Amino acid sequence: RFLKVKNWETDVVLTDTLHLKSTLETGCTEHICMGSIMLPTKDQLFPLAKEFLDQYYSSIKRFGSKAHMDRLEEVNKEIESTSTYQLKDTELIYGAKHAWRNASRCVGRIQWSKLQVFDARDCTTAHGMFNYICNHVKYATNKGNLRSAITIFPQRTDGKHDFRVWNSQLIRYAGYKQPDGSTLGDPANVQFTEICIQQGWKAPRGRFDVLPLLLQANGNDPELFQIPPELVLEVPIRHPKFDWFKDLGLKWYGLPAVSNMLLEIGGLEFSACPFSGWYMGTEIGVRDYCDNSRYNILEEVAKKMDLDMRKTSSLWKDQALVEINIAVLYSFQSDKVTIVDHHSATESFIKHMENEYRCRGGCPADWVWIVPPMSGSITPVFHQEMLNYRLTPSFEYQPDPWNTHVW
Amino acid sequence: RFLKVKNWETDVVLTDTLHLKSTLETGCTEHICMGSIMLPVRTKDQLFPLAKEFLDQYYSSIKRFGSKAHMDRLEEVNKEIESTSTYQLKDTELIYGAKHAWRNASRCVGRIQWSKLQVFDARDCTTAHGMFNYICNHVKYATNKGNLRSAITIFPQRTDGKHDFRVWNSQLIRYAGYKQPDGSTLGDPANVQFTEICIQQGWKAPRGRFDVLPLLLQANGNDPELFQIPPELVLEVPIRHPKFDWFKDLGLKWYGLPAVSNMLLEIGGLEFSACPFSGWYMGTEIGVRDYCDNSRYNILEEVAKKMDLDMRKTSSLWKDQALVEINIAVLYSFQSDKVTIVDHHSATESFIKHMENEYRCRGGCPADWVWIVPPMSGSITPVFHQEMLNYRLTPSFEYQPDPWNTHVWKG
Ligand code: HEM
Ligand code: HEM
Ligand SMILES: Nc1ccc2ccc(CCNCCCc3cccc(F)c3)cc2n1
Ligand SMILES: Nc1ccc2ccc(CCNCCCc3cccc(F)c3)cc2n1
Ligand SMILES: C[C@H](O)[C@H](O)[C@H]1CNc2nc(N)[nH]c(=O)c2N1
Ligand SMILES: C[C@H](O)[C@H](O)[C@H]1CNc2nc(N)[nH]c(=O)c2N1
Ligand SMILES: [Zn+2]
Numbered sequence: 001r002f003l004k005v006k007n008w009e010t011d012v013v014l015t016d017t018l019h020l021k022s023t024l025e026t027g028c029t030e031h032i033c034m035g036s037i038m039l040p041t042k043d044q045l046f047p048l049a050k051e052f053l054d055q056y057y058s059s060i061k062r063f064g065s066k067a068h069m070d071r072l073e074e075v076n077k078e079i080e081s082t083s084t085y086q087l088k089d090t091e092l093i094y095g096a097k098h099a100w101r102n103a104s105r106c107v108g109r110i111q112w113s114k115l116q117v118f119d120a121r122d123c124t125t126a127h128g129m130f131n132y133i134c135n136h137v138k139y140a141t142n143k144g145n146l147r148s149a150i151t152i153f154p155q156r157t158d159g160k161h162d163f164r165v166w167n168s169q170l171i172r173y174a175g176y177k178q179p180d181g182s183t184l185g186d187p188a189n190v191q192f193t194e195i196c197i198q199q200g201w202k203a204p205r206g207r208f209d210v211l212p213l214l215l216q217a218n219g220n221d222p223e224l225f226q227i228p229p230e231l232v233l234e235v236p237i238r239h240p241k242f243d244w245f246k247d248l249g250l251k252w253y254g255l256p257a258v259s260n261m262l263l264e265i266g267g268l269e270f271s272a273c274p275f276s277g278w279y280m281g282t283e284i285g286v287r288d289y290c291d292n293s294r295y296n297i298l299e300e301v302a303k304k305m306d307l308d309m310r311k312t313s314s315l316w317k318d319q320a321l322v323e324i325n326i327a328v329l330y331s332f333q334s335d336k337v338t339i340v341d342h343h344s345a346t347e348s349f350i351k352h353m354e355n356e357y358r359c360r361g362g363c364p365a366d367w368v369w370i371v372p373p374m375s376g377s378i379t380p381v382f383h384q385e386m387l388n389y390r391l392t393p394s395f396e397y398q399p400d401p402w403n404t405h406v407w
Numbered sequence: 408r409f410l411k412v413k414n415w416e417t418d419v420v421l422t423d424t425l426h427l428k429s430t431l432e433t434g435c436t437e438h439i440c441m442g443s444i445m446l447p448v449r450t451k452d453q454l455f456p457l458a459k460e461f462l463d464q465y466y467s468s469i470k471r472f473g474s475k476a477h478m479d480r481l482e483e484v485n486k487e488i489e490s491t492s493t494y495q496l497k498d499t500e501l502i503y504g505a506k507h508a509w510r511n512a513s514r515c516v517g518r519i520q521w522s523k524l525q526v527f528d529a530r531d532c533t534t535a536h537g538m539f540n541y542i543c544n545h546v547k548y549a550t551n552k553g554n555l556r557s558a559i560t561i562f563p564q565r566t567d568g569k570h571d572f573r574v575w576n577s578q579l580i581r582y583a584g585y586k587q588p589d590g591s592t593l594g595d596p597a598n599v600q601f602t603e604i605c606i607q608q609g610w611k612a613p614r615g616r617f618d619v620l621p622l623l624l625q626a627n628g629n630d631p632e633l634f635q636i637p638p639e640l641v642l643e644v645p646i647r648h649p650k651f652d653w654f655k656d657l658g659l660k661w662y663g664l665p666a667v668s669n670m671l672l673e674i675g676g677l678e679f680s681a682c683p684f685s686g687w688y689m690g691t692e693i694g695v696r697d698y699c700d701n702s703r704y705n706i707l708e709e710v711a712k713k714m715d716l717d718m719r720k721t722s723s724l725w726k727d728q729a730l731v732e733i734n735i736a737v738l739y740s741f742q743s744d745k746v747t748i749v750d751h752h753s754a755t756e757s758f759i760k761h762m763e764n765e766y767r768c769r770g771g772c773p774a775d776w777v778w779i780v781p782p783m784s785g786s787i788t789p790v791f792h793q794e795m796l797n798y799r800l801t802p803s804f805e806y807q808p809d810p811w812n813t814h815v816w817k818g
Binding site: 314317 | 412415426433434442444695696699700734742750752775777781786793798
């Protein structure tokens, strides 16, 4: 019932009670652990609204006040009559911040309470969404001094009128198959790149072509828009000691900004809610560059370093991997674009867990995602037991819209 | 119920039906996942079902299910339980058992090898001296002058829980740790406590950085006895680096035989509390964990110093750089002395092929991702991208409490 987590490097033991407030289900049972699976009405809504409002008013130390009981009645009335309800600004801000706070896969959560929330609930068209998105991108980029933010479009009503950003992130690079049969650019976005072309985009057909935005308002068909290049901050990737590294021709974008998730607050569903923070180096250098199914450049780099690629046991992949990641961090830091390394991020998160254990009674954490994709055991999160559970408000995945949409 | 796992790099999808034969519990529920928690005497009552399930599995594996020999064995075990309260395994069922425990070990990346296990039956053993003899033979056979062979030695099973056989060491070969008055540690910090127990039982400690510990062996619930493993039987490898000549001057070595001696083997409800087993090392066990854990030898700083890396900011990745070099060294050293070792790329690739084969022939392969993924360079190994289902089959290896917290001293 009251659960303990131990750090095996420091012997620090924390007691978890926040898990008892968990509501949603994990995928696991007493017979099977699903910890490494990537994705495991009016009557329905009031309990949801109540649970959310009760936590809001406790958070502002007004649990059981006239103000609390009055709001519970006001939303109860609004549901009974309208079948949905509207969040107050203050509740919206709190909800969004708490969706990040409860994101068990996110190592960056020490920052959860500095999140700039942009209320785009008055938006009605794709051109509108475009305008809101450009303002978000420019505000968050802050000329390389990056600031966290979320922009919240209108909530689902009857699911026939959804707002969606079809892009998986606001800024991503294009991918094209070839008659060759190999792949130019980013192979993860091949299908989305086709949908854009198939919608009308004129692809330059390069390695690092910033994709166009595809925005859907009110369940209408979505529309293309180019983000002004001047708003897309990019970093050329060089190495502090390998001169030839610059000649590989690599760059990445400064602003990580996920746009295909659904934000759930007090039972209400916000299907378009792009948010952004800043990169941990490994996301670009380990995953983007070195995944077999991504830019997959390890082979090409190890060659330039003249390492022995005859045997896996020379650890030539490993050697190359480190150098790529030293380069990513170096380039960003040199150009003054915020980035965090995996050592500093994981250390922060250990302190965040401490803070949340004492102030909140726990911190849901998914170990499989929190431990970085390189050098796991030399980061302190490797040795830290974590309990994973689902709290609300939350971010959730949702199906890619082209499987759902009705044209 | 059929359950799919997807490899996200290859798009290979596999279907698990084997999870249906799982009886024991995970620690998890529908509301909490305990997948990163390190650790989440029987009556006639609970024993014949466990026996029967074990023998239905054994008899299916040999294609004799429902034969007269299957039924007669069931009847014979039943009578022996209700007459004597326990029962004895046949040699063949013991071999099958020990192998399936390995095969079912969800945290083991080296399971491709499960069916090549040399089983030594030590169930006639009665004294600590007899245990020492058995363990020596295990170590010489397994070592095989550097061409390592997998093996397990099985001492008598638990009876009333008051006559247990235990190996007090956590591995058959492991180095001392000594806490100094100034708070520093000499040798391996992981073994301080155990080193302290040996001292007190009368071991005269050389007190160096790499002193092979003595065996502390308990037979028949008796007080443990100290033995020294003959040094000529302890194969060791000095660590050097193929390019950095100063690496040898760090003074490092390691032993070649990894041999876990503190787990409990369960087969058809029987509990073997002393069942030391051994394979060979994956390089990262020594290079990443044994040398570079902060709570272990912790040589990262000294290695980075000698490489004159930039140690003023973690963003130089000086730690990551030092770690790869140390691991290269470990692998070069073992290979140069012709001692079996496997790198993490080779081992994880093998495992993915094992896992696939197991889904085809067995209908599943339980696997613990937190443990299967190597502790360096995770995402450039294919296991990182592999979805896995973790569940508990029997026979199985299990943890047990350290014997010094439970033993009743005789004096
Ligand atoms: C401020 C800097 C931030 C850092 C360094 C950071 C770091 C990370 C990292 C490394 C991951 C794993 C991503 C992957 O491997 O695909 C992650 C996942 C996640 N982060 Fe954060 N994050 C940050 C800000 C945010 C903010 C502002 C939000 C929300 C407001 C957020 C919500 C999430 C969610 C929902 C996931 C997992 C989504 C999924 O399950 O696919 N992150 N983050
Ligand atoms: C033949 C070469 C072998 C290799 C390379 C291999 C590799 C590994 C590695 C890397 C781990 C995780 C170790 C750690 O990080 O602490 C492991 C765990 C395990 N292995 Fe294997 N193994 C091998 C043979 C065996 C044998 C012969 C047995 C039993 C007969 C076995 C049973 C297990 C068990 C029970 C664990 C989990 C221990 C725990 O939960 O603490 N291994 N093995
Ligand atoms: N630096 C940051 C900041 C915020 C982030 C917020 C979210 C994310 C992760 C976005 N990942 C979604 C894609 C993961 C996925 C899941 C299932 C299947 C699949 F193909 C891909 C990364 C972040 N990085
Ligand atoms: N190369 C091999 C072969 C067989 C192996 C068999 C088992 C093992 C792991 C042995 N570790 C036992 C203790 C793990 C543990 C659990 C809880 C707390 C703790 F500090 C350590 C490693 C192996 N390596
Ligand atoms: C199969 C496994 O769940 C999958 O590869 C996961 C593992 N851990 C991860 N961890 C992070 N941070 N990001 C990811 O995409 C993944 N992918
Ligand atoms: C807390 C966490 O589960 C623990 O540190 C685990 C993580 N994964 C591991 N994986 C292996 N192979 N060996 C280990 O000791 C550990 N330690
Ligand atoms: Zn689980």
